[PDB]
Amino acid sequence: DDFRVGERVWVNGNKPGFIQFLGETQFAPGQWAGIVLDEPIGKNDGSVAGVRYFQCEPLKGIFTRPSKLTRKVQATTP
């Protein structure tokens, strides 16, 4: 089963969140997954260079390739 919008994922296997976006962007080619993280340990608010892909609180958003996502937790932060 492939990834779908709304699914519980772990970015790089350690940062928990939900997929809010799955598609093409203006910042880079190919398919990108836009995730709203549980905590503000991300890089954006769902927008990049003024273009909005999804909406979340500042630094709770992050974009990654779908293959870097895991459905369950996989193993310098206190």
* Cα dihedral 19, 39, 47, 22 in deg (nearest 10): -10
Distinct helix (H) and strand (E) counts, the chain:
0, 7
| Alpha-carbon span 73 to 30, nearest angstrom | 25
| Alpha-carbon span 69 to 5, nearest angstrom | 13
Q: How was this structure determined?
A: X-ray
Would the CA dihedral through 12, 13, 14, 15 be positive or negative?
A: positive
Strand, coil or helix: what is 67?
Answer: helix
Resolution in Å equals 2.0
Domains of the chain: 1-78 (2.30.30.190)
| Alpha-carbon span 21 to 11, nearest angstrom | 14
Q: Output the CA–CA distances (angstroms, integers) from residue 6 to 9, 49, 50, in the order listed.
A: 9, 24, 23
Q: Output the CA–CA distances (angstroms, integers) from residue 56 to 2, 47, 59, 66, 74, in the order listed.
A: 24, 9, 8, 19, 25
What are the two backbone dihedrals, phi and then psi, of residue 68, each rounded to the nearest 5 degrees? -90, -5
Give the DSSP per-residue string, 35-56: EEESSS-SSBSSEETTEESS--
What's 72's DSSP letter?
Answer: S
